[PDB]
Amino acid sequence: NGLRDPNTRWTFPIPYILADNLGLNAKGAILYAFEMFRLKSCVDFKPYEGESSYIIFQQFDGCWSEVGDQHVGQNISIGQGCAYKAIIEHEILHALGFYHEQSRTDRDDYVNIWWDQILSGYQHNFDTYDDSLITDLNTPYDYESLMHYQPFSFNKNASVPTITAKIPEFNSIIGQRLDFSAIDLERLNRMYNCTTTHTLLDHCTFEKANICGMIQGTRDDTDWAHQDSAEVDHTLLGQCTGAGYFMQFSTSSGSAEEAALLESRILYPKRKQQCLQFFYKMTGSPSDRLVVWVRRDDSTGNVRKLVKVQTFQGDDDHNWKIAHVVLKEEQKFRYLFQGTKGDPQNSTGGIYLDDITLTETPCPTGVWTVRNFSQVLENTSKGDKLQSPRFYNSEGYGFGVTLYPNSRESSGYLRLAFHVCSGENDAILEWPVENRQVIITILDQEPDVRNRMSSSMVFTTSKSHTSPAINDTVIWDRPSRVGTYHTDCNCFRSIDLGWSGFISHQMLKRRSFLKNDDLIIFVDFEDITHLS
Amino acid sequence: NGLRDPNTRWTFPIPYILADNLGLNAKGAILYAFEMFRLKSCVDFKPYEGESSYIIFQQFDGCWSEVGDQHVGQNISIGQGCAYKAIIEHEILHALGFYHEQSRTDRDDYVNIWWDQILSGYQHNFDTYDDSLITDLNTPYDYESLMHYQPFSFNKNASVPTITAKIPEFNSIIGQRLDFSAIDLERLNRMYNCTTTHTLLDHCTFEKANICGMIQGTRDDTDWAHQDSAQAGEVDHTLLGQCTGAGYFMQFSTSSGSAEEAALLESRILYPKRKQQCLQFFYKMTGSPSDRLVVWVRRDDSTGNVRKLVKVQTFQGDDDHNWKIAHVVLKEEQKFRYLFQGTKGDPQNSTGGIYLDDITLTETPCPTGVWTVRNFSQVLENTSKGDKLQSPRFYNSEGYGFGVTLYPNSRESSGYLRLAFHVCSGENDAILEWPVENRQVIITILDQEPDVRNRMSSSMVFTTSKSHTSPAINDTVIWDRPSRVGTYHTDCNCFRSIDLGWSGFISHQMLKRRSFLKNDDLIIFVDFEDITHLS
């Protein structure tokens, strides 16, 4: 589906303008979509500085873009309801030189277009272009392509689909709005020669003979073991013996205060802040400690300087846990895991590691894990709720999320809603909390970020958000006077806002959103007033 | 004592070379002395990159410098036994253009020189120069100067002084080795036109009604009171009731109202020149154990608008109701404001509140470990010779545990305090390198003044070494792992190493001077940091 002409290609970075007719939320969502290009490709973006060709983003009616670099400059439109990661990703892919997936020259072998049922003025979104205009890039028809339309796209009658696959099962798949597909990234790579990315710096499932270039120090008491899953890893959940590998550190024998270091390869950063994401178990004593360290360049070039960054200790949950550690490395470094034995006479177990990822991105502000989700989803009635632990953002605001496993508002869908929690800082924070962008994300447990298609939704807190339940006062005002008391956290929690129909039960049982029968949700609550 | 010819003046930053015949300890001590110049003056230093005049620091015999800029480049010698802040500062003051204070043209009015006592070849250190060579910079003769010799300097006979003050009280005062005097800084500023300094960013004693430009918002519930010290049993830290109608502190009361009521006190906007700052202040918490003092930043949101909050640290009240010192690390690289939130907890269980005085903000690290010894005059009476006190265990950035030993009445040196450093066992020791090979220790007794230009804090420096060994441990390195070389203590569950330090760190008579014992308590700072990157 790529425009054949080699003259129609951008030279990176793409220069851009965000027009002031975009709201704060749309500005934020475009800047968020840019980070997905930088994480999964070598496409990059810069502010406009007098270049010949550029993108300007505007709030015109609907979502649309020109195709390819048009060398005078061009518009992307992000209309009302178009401010979403996936939809902005769809439009920037047009500007990069892509047509829709149904616009391939071979598409008639794969789909039906029901021509009578398209709304007038939209028929060109269902046209096909001849092989002089477009190229296959040696790739098949990707029904999961972000550039494909959903069945009910610009239809006359809501009961009748405009587009269907010639095999009916794919009607459940066509027109996903999660993320870039694997073949969409492969096509974008094949068009622009990217193979590296700007912000994926390391990843390790431990399934290599060199263990991803990790090493172990002599200046410790013991070693971590490369463990055969023959007690199962996180990458494959024990699908076969010797297929999934992990690092294990036993704590059931020896002295207390014995330890082992696992050190990464040396890493060269391109940004000032990194996020280390990893999965772990702690089945041993409550006094065992998994400690994360950095060993960094001393400014001579010798990577020999230790810094302790975080400590983890064992509760009564012995299942796999996700961990996020903020690093702040600006010179070459190695990240380190120290496992420490404590009370071996009261440990029947140890420390486990798998599925490490390192990105040059922020770590998520709040993480909620809901266990046994496929059982919770049957045990919970329509409109019954789960509520998160309270989270604090960088500004000190308390927040949380409400999850309704069965939405009364849309059957066969999940409903996620954000709320503000009362917290220890409230007495000095500004109220109502507005111009704060909420990004809720349901993670794809893929340890490689080029494979992930995480669901995400975005909104910005506004003075327009009001409810009759609080006498038409702002939902985001101080929780002690616009919220209700909960014994689970001793909080007041606001009225909750978000999406009925966030993700379907038929989507959630796919793409590893439930990899160990558990759901992981990321929440960012951050001020975007500086985009005004 | 300054050189009169303006062609002898430097252009800043002064380019320098640290020669490899300096050991690590000496190189690290020189860089520490440059920080003291950047903290108290506008003098600055850069690594050499091919300039015409520069200073090369080397280890030769004795400790010496040429006087003023020699336009082709010049040596400073830093010999064995001269890796000390005050000695390095004294040599740098020679290179900047100063002679000794006993070399002033008027010196005969203030001191006697005993020439027949001077060791051969050292007598030129005692020469006086004429008013055509040297300026007084319109300053009086300073007995407390860093450029003045001690009585027993280059003397043939250990019992007989080479130099004495004409008024005998000053024989106990001449030859101080603390820091720059107030007059030495005034001379350096007059010679080089300094007004600002590179590293002092703010300070506040609250003595003016303007409260150093601090403001109080209305997004909080209440206000901090600017409180007068005219109440019995409550005073400020700056003057401690010495001075009627004079000493002010901020007070936030917690004995009435609702719980979780708060007040914000907020600084003026600050433009940091570095990436890291240290906020030092003094406080009391006489209220409920549930009261909080919280330090915050409000920083530029990248639009030029200072409206972005970050919480930095929290403080809570134990059973000590006297003034406590606090240090907070800030890492600001754009314009910002530092903020104090006082918070009420349990007003039905409070008869007091939160107190603030003596704020200082510098573009430096914070001290790695801080020890306060309370009632020090009474400790100094009630402790026998060679009995000891030991600090809580500190941890450095690399995760090594360390502490300090204080012997208030030193047996080895009568009329002196002995202060020493040890490595503590700690939770990281299993993965750290042993023995410590090249970590510099800096120990400082704080002269308690809120303006850093008024402080003469006593400091000592050494570097941990393979050569530090004891017969008590079969001639093994003192800095090997504390569980194999140290003795167990019930006081912290640590093993503490053999200590290394200075009998004669400071005299009892020096300690009862200036602001070393301000509220009858002693404050010791410690830093313990790797200098291998200078090799």
Ligand SMILES: *[C@@H]1O[C@H](CO[C@@H]2O[C@@H](C)[C@@H](O)[C@@H](O)[C@@H]2O)[C@@H](O[C@@H]2O[C@H](CO)[C@@H](O[C@@H]3O[C@H](CO)[C@@H](O)[C@H](O)[C@@H]3O)[C@H](O)[C@H]2NC(C)=O)[C@H](O)[C@H]1NC(C)=O
């Ligand atoms: C020994 O370690 C156990 C936990 O370790 C587990 O059991 C060992 C025998 C080994 O098999 C280990 O591999 C295994 O991980 C400690 O027991 C724990 O004690 C804590 C503190 O009392 C308990 O937490 C409390 O739980 C109660 C409810 O039961 C709550 O009301 C409290 O608020 C609090 O959360 C914890 O539940 C308990 N866990 C278990 C599984 O027993 C034990 O204390 C420790 N003993 C020694 C000698 O240190």
Ligand SMILES: *[C@@H]1O[C@H](CO[C@@H]2O[C@@H](C)[C@@H](O)[C@@H](O)[C@@H]2O)[C@@H](O[C@@H]2O[C@H](CO)[C@@H](O[C@@H]3O[C@H](CO)[C@@H](O)[C@H](O)[C@@H]3O)[C@H](O)[C@H]2NC(C)=O)[C@H](O)[C@H]1NC(C)=O
């Ligand atoms: C009420 O607050 C007091 C302390 O506050 C003081 O007294 C109030 C009536 C007011 O006049 C305040 O202005 C004043 O500051 C609390 O008492 C303290 O409780 C702590 C914690 O239990 C005690 O610390 C312990 O001390 C024992 C030894 O005695 C140690 O073994 C423990 O490890 C621990 O350190 C502290 O001694 C005690 N102090 C006093 C003065 O009694 C009191 O708990 C609090 N009550 C309520 C309702 O919160």
Ligand SMILES: *[C@@H]1O[C@H](CO)[C@@H](O[C@@H]2O[C@H](CO)[C@@H](O[C@@H]3O[C@H](CO)[C@@H](O)[C@H](O)[C@H]3NC(C)=O)[C@H](O)[C@H]2NC(C)=O)[C@H](O)[C@H]1NC(C)=O
């Ligand atoms: C602090 O500021 C002072 C001025 O307020 C400086 O003093 C000036 O130094 C100049 C040299 O840098 C002098 O100029 C010289 O004057 C002599 C005669 O005195 C002439 O022979 C020289 O040719 C001439 N040189 C130049 C370069 O012009 C100024 O006369 C002198 N002014 C005063 C009032 O003394 C200090 O040097 C300065 N200190 C530092 C180092 O910052």
Ligand SMILES: *[C@@H]1O[C@H](CO)[C@@H](O[C@@H]2O[C@H](CO)[C@@H](O)[C@H](O)[C@H]2NC(C)=O)[C@H](O)[C@H]1NC(C)=O
């Ligand atoms: C984006 O579309 C706008 C119209 O909505 C374009 O603005 C017009 O540009 C033409 C050609 O320069 C002018 O004749 C019109 O007067 C403009 N109209 C308005 C409303 O400004 C804009 O040029 C497009 N962006 C680019 C660079 O392609």
Ligand SMILES: *[C@@H]1O[C@H](CO)[C@@H](O[C@@H]2O[C@H](CO)[C@@H](O)[C@H](O)[C@H]2NC(C)=O)[C@H](O)[C@H]1NC(C)=O
């Ligand atoms: C949309 O299509 C549906 C399905 O064809 C239409 O529903 C039918 O309406 C006719 C009358 O027009 C009835 O005779 C059928 O029984 C209905 N079928 C069903 C399944 O309901 C509907 O009328 C159409 N609506 C529009 C907008 O034309």
Ligand SMILES: *[C@@H]1O[C@H](CO)[C@@H](O[C@@H]2O[C@H](CO)[C@@H](O)[C@H](O)[C@H]2NC(C)=O)[C@H](O)[C@H]1NC(C)=O
């Ligand atoms: C500063 O020290 C250096 C290193 O010692 C001196 O360089 C040599 O010094 C020796 C001993 O005085 C002389 O024999 C050599 O002829 C010197 N070589 C040169 C000229 O580099 C240097 O002379 C000293 N003096 C200064 C101020 O540079």
Ligand SMILES: *[C@@H]1O[C@H](CO)[C@@H](O[C@@H]2O[C@H](CO)[C@@H](O)[C@H](O)[C@H]2NC(C)=O)[C@H](O)[C@H]1NC(C)=O
């Ligand atoms: C240093 O000076 C002292 C004091 O003058 C000397 O001590 C005297 O020594 C002489 C003999 O040489 C005795 O007769 C005196 O009684 C001593 N006086 C005192 C007060 O002890 C000392 O010998 C000198 N030492 C040196 C290095 O010459």
Ligand SMILES: O=C(CCN(Cc1ccc2c(c1)OCO2)Cc1ccc2c(c1)OCO2)NO
């Ligand atoms: O065709 C268009 C329209 C924009 N958009 C297409 C689309 C977006 C993401 C996709 C996708 C298809 O399939 C995979 O993921 C659909 C759309 C969404 C919200 C709207 C809206 C239209 O109108 C206002 O609110 N422009 O390019």
Ligand SMILES: O=C(CCN(Cc1ccc2c(c1)OCO2)Cc1ccc2c(c1)OCO2)NO
């Ligand atoms: O005169 C000299 C000598 C250097 N130094 C002078 C001096 C230093 C700091 C001062 C001070 C005087 O009075 C206030 O503070 C004395 C000295 C110290 C240690 C030594 C040593 C000599 O020899 C080896 O070990 N050069 O300039």
Ligand SMILES: *[C@@H]1O[C@H](CO)[C@@H](O)[C@H](O)[C@H]1NC(C)=O
């Ligand atoms: C999940 O189900 C398992 C049994 O399959 C049970 O042992 C475990 O306690 C459950 N965990 C939660 C959090 O419900």
Ligand SMILES: *[C@@H]1O[C@H](CO)[C@@H](O)[C@H](O)[C@H]1NC(C)=O
């Ligand atoms: C100092 O002495 C006073 C009594 O004069 C006592 O109340 C206080 O606790 C002492 N402080 C310490 C810990 O030395």
Ligand SMILES: [Ca+2]
């Ligand atoms: Ca694995």
Ligand SMILES: [Ca+2]
């Ligand atoms: Ca090892």
Ligand SMILES: [Ca+2]
């Ligand atoms: Ca106020």
Ligand SMILES: [Ca+2]
């Ligand atoms: Ca004061």
Ligand SMILES: [Zn+2]
């Ligand atoms: Zn499209």
